[PDB]
Amino acid sequence: MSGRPGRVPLQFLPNEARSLPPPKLTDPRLVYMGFLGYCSGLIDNAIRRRPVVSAGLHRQLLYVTSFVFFGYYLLKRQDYMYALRDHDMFAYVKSHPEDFPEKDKKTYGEILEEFHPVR
Amino acid sequence: LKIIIPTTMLLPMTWMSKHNMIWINATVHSLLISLISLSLLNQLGENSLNFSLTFFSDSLSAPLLVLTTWLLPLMLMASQSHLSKETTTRKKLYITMLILLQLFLIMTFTATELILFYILFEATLVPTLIIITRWGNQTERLNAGLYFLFYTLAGSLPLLVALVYIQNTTGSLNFLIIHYWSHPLSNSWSNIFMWLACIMAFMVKMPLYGLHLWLPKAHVEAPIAGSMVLAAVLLKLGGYGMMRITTILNPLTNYMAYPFLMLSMWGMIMTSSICLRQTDLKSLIAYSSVSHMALVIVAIMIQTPWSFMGATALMIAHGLTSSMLFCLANTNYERVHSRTMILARGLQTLLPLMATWWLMASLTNLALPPSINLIGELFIITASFSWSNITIILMGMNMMITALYSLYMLITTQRGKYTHHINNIKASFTRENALMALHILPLLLLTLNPKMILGPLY
Amino acid sequence: KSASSLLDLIWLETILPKTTSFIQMKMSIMVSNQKGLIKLYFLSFLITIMISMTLFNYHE
Amino acid sequence: RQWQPDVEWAEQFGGAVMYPTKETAHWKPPPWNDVDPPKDTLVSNLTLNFGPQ
Amino acid sequence: PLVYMNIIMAFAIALAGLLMYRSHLMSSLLCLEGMMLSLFIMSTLIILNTHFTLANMMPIILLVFAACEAALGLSLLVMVSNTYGTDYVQNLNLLQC
Amino acid sequence: LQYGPLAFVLGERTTRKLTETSKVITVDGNICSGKGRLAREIAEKLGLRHFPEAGIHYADSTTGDGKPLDVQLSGNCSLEKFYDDPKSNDGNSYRLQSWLYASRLLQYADALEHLLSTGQGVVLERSIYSDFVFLEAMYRQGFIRKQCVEHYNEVKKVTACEYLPPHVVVYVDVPVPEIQSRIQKKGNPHEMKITAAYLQDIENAYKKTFLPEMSEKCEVLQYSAREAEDAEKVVEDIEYLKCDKGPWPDQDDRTFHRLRMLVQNKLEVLNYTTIPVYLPEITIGAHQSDRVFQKFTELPGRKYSPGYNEDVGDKWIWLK
Amino acid sequence: NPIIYTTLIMTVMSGTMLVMISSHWLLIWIGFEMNLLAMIPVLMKNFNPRATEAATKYFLTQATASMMLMMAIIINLLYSGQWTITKMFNPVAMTMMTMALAMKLGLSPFHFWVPEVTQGISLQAGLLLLTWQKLAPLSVLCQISQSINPNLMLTMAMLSILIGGWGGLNQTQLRKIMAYSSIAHMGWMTAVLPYNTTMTILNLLIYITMTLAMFMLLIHSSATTTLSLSHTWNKMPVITSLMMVTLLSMGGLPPLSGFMPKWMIIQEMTKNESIIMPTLMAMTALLNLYFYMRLAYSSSLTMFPSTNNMKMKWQFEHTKQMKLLPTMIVLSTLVLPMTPALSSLN
Ligand SMILES: Nc1nc2c(ncn2[C@@H]2O[C@H](COP(=O)(O)OP(=O)(O)OP(=O)(O)O)[C@@H](O)[C@H]2O)c(=O)[nH]1
Ligand SMILES: [Mg+2]
């Protein structure tokens, strides 16, 4: 991570993160973060003792848009870190066969797992 | 999954509705959501009903959710005795807590992950202490919140460390995966503490003899809505947990069970004997709940097919009746403005129908046949007797006391001679009588075909 | 006398819950009760330094 | 009416330490303005004896 | 070498001197000031020894901020000496609570 | 948009706006001594703003429509009850003084805010520096308990410390026998219920404490009763006054910035008037607090923020 | 004068940023003074005897830690000859640094300064001290986490959690208990620091956001004592409602976002075979939960007697806008379902 080769510091979504499928606008994680924008909208009028459901909708609309915007790139970075974590992981096992052997998976007919009577 | 979204959908329901329609609108949609919940006992065979990656149901959960979804209307009309004088926002926020509570219990039972279960399992606490402390009546309701929550976390937190440990070792804790990828528990000293950590969290939310000080310290002072929901489903959250977590705790369960089931065995006689000597009416059902709740502790510990069925049968049946006796506690308490048992006596000559509800409540808690209380208790006896022959002399001696205090409350309150100086009891409204009816009828008419209630092992 | 008063109301509630409640209560006082003198604070920082690198010797 | 806290219950956690002891029994909760009042005047201008030499 | 030993134990007693207040803050403040003199001499000893030309930088630049720390230090002591009059750390406890 | 730290950076100064006639002046006198008239004449003569003596509902005058709200909703204290039965067990005496102190405290803050903002001089009847004397007269008559005095001097020292004395203070000297004649002529039935010892007690604590310590803090003008009617004469002295004695001259723009920021944040202004001292009279119980506050809510123009209440008629709410 | 107070606040931010962007051991120290130089003025902005009290107490410990921090670097120079920010090559020097940085953070018995200073200074400066200076030492600890002594840092972390949360239920001033609560949160992030640095940042961010949300709420309520906060229910009951919601958030009960670090911290520690240590810190975190509810008990969940003059406060309204308050509250309570975002930090 903080030391992987070919990394540009302070660089957000890089030139290969775009190879992954983008999160959909109907992403359940994304809309929930939009719901946090909706929640952060209504509470604002509570401190300022304003109608919590029918006050200035410009604040509420701007509260939701900001959350849904910054979330989308975070949700893009979300998968890219996991994809990068998954990518290098599979290269290591391929490059180090001796640390990850394949046991000859044998059926339960041969397995001597003992029986515990409960009574 | 089709239950949760409408359950969340009641959150805007109550919070927006007109000043006088909040309870009407909340009452109906809680009654309508019992439809979609009632389609959850609708079940396939031995395979569980898995309808989503994160949510699943089986014959053990199915009675539970239909209990909670049914339950919320009961606390809705129950709270319509003392919330009338409160402000609208406080009234709306009371529904918010109850609806938020539903959203949790409706989701713990459907959780297919141990941590997701645990996250929501202890998440139900946050709505509770709001109910007990904010809307409580007496003075020591403040001490009620500390006793309830600290007892719960002191056992729940080591379970969280245990769960992540299992996550790292075997790889996953999905309720199916651990069942299929089972592994016997070695007698290593480390496994003993892991077993203890896994079980202790559900023990504290399963009043054990010694880990039960919060039972009389929470139910008595809690509001009426909080009292039944904490006694009817909240105590069962551990019951669901132990039935599930025991799949990975064998064979260490059988050898390690002796310190625990026996403490439940001896205390369940003791706790029932406590009810024989009581001064507070609401303390009767609290302590009676402890003895009944501790009965299934033995059943789950034996891990016997009959015991599990009896545990589930008693689990729902006790929750229904324990909630009922709390409603009858409320009506008498509201009329007399006191919780003392010996104060209000001879109430049957004034409220004949209320006496009949008292009769049915105490007699069902007495666990006569064919009531679900008896069939659940009888299955436990047979399983316990197979485990050991002496078990009958103890758990049978509980039924000795169980019949006593059940009739003791009936005799001293309804029967006898009325106290003359009480000039407060009016005729009972149609609310409580319907509230009692909505408690008694589902229990009785479930008796014809209780096989939705026995559980997955049926 | 034995079931309710002795065990539940007295013994069972004084063994586990109130003891730990008192254990935190018994000596949380001077945890918060400090004289406020810079002398006592910085003298304590001295001992923490010596115990770290000389007595228990995390380096060694 | 449900029991609401009274004045006496308010004084429980109302002192400098809600959990007091003899060591802190003589303490004094901080002033609400968070400013201690000025103490005794501390001017000590020295006296210079000009003259007669 | 032995010269290094002499001036790191200069730190040690300076370390002991700083976090040991007896009567007044001024003596401790001076000990904090003099504490960097060993720090100056310490850092200076390696840098001429090792002939690293650039890092002759830091002995002077350590002197910029160490004495600047003292500069705000004794100027803070001015604020004490008006409200408190004296400069005693024993009296310096009005936040007992 | 009101003057904050941003305005100071942009260029909004306040020592530029003030002028020679930028004086805040308080008139003082005994009970119904006619000083309120003198405040009016000096205000209009030099073009100074007049602030009437702050009553129980003065806070109601600066909030909403400026009309006196219900006493039970705006203090639960009546000056008439203070007049009729001073030793009432409910404790209306300290409820009068403590509430009136904050009303004067709000009066003083608004007067200084106007003086610091526009620079046009402000004249108000009495002040917080003249408020302690009324309570001192009360304690000197058995009117009040000593713990009430301790609470009042605590909050007064806490709240009035960072404020500055007013530019000029002018007092009219009317003797007690003359004062008794004036109130008797008034005919308001509540003000026969007075004590001559109380009237000398309030008079004594003026000239013994108020005027002495106020002298070194700002200029004092002791004025005779007959001289007061000559509204022409009383104003020439205040016109050509030294206006140098006190902390008013040594006041830079930065300390003026702190003063304006304090007075403009009205909640802070009387924030410490609600000290958690749990006096038996001062404290209002929880159920009363909720019900009275719950009452305050549906009063028109109170449920939401100003300019946002539908019952008032505020439109454009969905985009306000 | 406000224009200058922007500059010293900027320099404190600039000095902190200098620490977290410097690759030279020298410049890392330079940022600490840049923080230290301009901190004392904003610490005694109100100019109270308590302000001078706290300012002097802050300076003595902080100057000692920074001064101890050089020859920790200098012995590294003696035995490595490297100025670059990497793992340390001499053990005794780096053990010396760990004490120095713990002094800045206030973890060990070194922690005595932070609760003392927080009370004397105002709430606004208390927030800045308690939410901004917890980054510069964190950055240095994050960098040198390679060769960090496990026993040394774990012992420091345990004590910071223990005394941090044990004396918390003994202070009636809110500014004190948060300093006490912060030391407990200081221990939580520092305990994971030797094992995995990523979860330290997440716990830092989660603790920081809650630190604003509470301190920012406190300024709006203008409270100094628990009784003073208790009176808030009679003016803005909603504000007192978010009060308790944040308390349970800082307690760590799900779904509230305060369960974020406690859930994430014990994960890799159990992965790292450290299991007894996670159990103890979790159980003693209930000490934090105790005085959290007690403040919630006195503020929101129950009423409290009010004063007569309190009624007039209803007539007037607050003038401070108190920017970014609603976002902090939501970001401090409803965040748990978005857990995988720790990868974004990673
Ligand atoms: N306790 C108290 N009573 C006040 C205060 N201001 C006025 N009063 C009462 O007001 C009543 C009338 O006396 P004053 O207000 O002094 O004078 P007035 O009758 O308005 O006449 P002028 O002095 O000419 O303005 C008396 O009952 C006073 O005690 C005050 O600040 N506190
Ligand atoms: Mg008058």
TrEMBL record, chain A:
GO terms for cellular component: mitochondrial inner membrane; respiratory chain complex I. It comes from the Eukaryota. The chain crosses the membrane at residues 59-75. One of its GO terms (biological process) is mitochondrial electron transport, NADH to ubiquinone. It holds the Pfam family NDUF_C2. InterPro entries: NDUC2. It is a single-pass membrane protein. Coiled coil: none annotated. Belongs to the complex I NDUFC2 subunit family. Accessory subunit of the mitochondrial membrane respiratory chain NADH dehydrogenase (Complex I), that is believed not to be involved in catalysis. Complex I functions in the transfer of electrons from NADH to the respiratory chain. The immediate electron acceptor for the enzyme is believed to be ubiquinone. PANTHER family: NADH DEHYDROGENASE [UBIQUINONE] 1 SUBUNIT C2-RELATED, NADH-UBIQUINONE OXIDOREDUCTASE SUBUNIT B14.5B. This is NADH dehydrogenase [ubiquinone] 1 subunit C2. It comes from Sus scrofa (Pig).
From TrEMBL, chain D:
It comes from the Eukaryota. Core subunit of respiratory chain NADH dehydrogenase (Complex I) which is composed of 45 different subunits. Component of the iron-sulfur (IP) fragment of the enzyme. Interacts with NDUFAF3. Interacts with NDUFAF7. Interacts with CERS2. Belongs to the complex I 49 kDa subunit family. This is NADH dehydrogenase [ubiquinone] iron-sulfur protein 2, mitochondrial. It comes from Sus scrofa (Pig). The lineage of its organism: Eukaryota, Metazoa, Chordata, Craniata, Vertebrata.
Automatic annotation (TrEMBL), chain F:
Complex I is composed of 45 different subunits. This a component of the hydrophobic protein fraction. GTP 2 binds at residues 32-36, 83, 97, 104, 126, 134. Mg(2+) 1 binds at residues 30, 32. Mg(2+) 2 binds at residues 35, 53, 125. InterPro entries: Deoxyribonucleoside_kinase, DNK_dom, NDUFA10, P-loop_NTPase. Belongs to the complex I NDUFA10 subunit family. It is found in: Mitochondrion matrix. GTP 4 binds at residues 32-36, 83, 97, 104, 126, 134, 186. Its main location: mitochondrion. Disulfide bonds join 218-243. This is NADH dehydrogenase [ubiquinone] 1 alpha subcomplex subunit 10, mitochondrial. The keyword RNA-binding does not apply. Pfam families: dNK. Accessory subunit of the mitochondrial membrane respiratory chain NADH dehydrogenase (Complex I), that is believed not to be involved in catalysis. Complex I functions in the transfer of electrons from NADH to the respiratory chain. The immediate electron acceptor for the enzyme is believed to be ubiquinone. Residues 25-238 form the Deoxynucleoside kinase domain. GO terms for cellular component: mitochondrial matrix. SUPFAM superfamilies: P-loop containing nucleoside triphosphate hydrolases (SSF52540). Keywords: Electron transport, FAD, Flavoprotein, GTP-binding, Metal-binding, Mitochondrion, Nucleotide-binding, Phosphoprotein, Respiratory chain, Transit peptide, Transport, Ubiquinone. GTP 1 binds at residues 32-36, 83, 97, 104, 126, 131, 134, 138, 191. Its cofactor is FAD. One of its GO terms (biological process) is mitochondrial electron transport, NADH to ubiquinone. The gene is NDUFA10.
